Design a protein around this ligand. Structure first.
Ligand SMILES: [Cl-]
Ligand code: NI
Length: 128
């Protein structure tokens, strides 16, 4: 049950960067290619920052998929909590590694993307 806490004791930009850094660590430790996540850093930052600030962000979801068939390999959910936390979190990456190899794939043979689960009334954000 991975939780990321946005505590208002910290700035939303710092919290956002720490969330992404914790996700980057998961991607790295799982053996996945980190390039896509780096390319998406600016857009992921904009959406997470904005929807943390409005309170609309509910979960950040890392979706691993098989690019040969485009079917889901596994999902890793990060639940968001708000209070008065720095955004950073740590988990056992074995779950991700295990799911990838269970699909008969090397991590260099899988792809991934971030999904953001929001309250339905949330404002639209450029790029999302
Ligand atoms: Cl925007
Ligand atoms: Ni602090």
């Amino acid at each position: 049950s991975t939780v990321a806490t946005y505590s208002y004791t910290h700035s939303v930009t710092y919290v956002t960067d720490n969330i992404l850094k914790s996700l980057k660590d998961i991607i790295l430790l799982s053996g996945l290619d980190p390039e896509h996540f780096a390319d998406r850093w600016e857009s992921n930052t904009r959406a997470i920052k904005t929807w943390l600030g409005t309170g609309d962000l509910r979960k950040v979801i890392l979706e691993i998929y098989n690019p040969a068939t485009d079917k889901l390999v596994t999902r890793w959910d990060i639940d968001i909590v708000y209070g008065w936390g720095d955004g950073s979190f740590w988990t056992d990456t074995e779950q991700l590694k295990y799911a990838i190899k269970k699909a008969g794939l090397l991590p260099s043979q899988a792809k991934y993307k971030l999904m953001l689960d929001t309250k339905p009334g949330r404002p639209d954000v450029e790029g999302w």
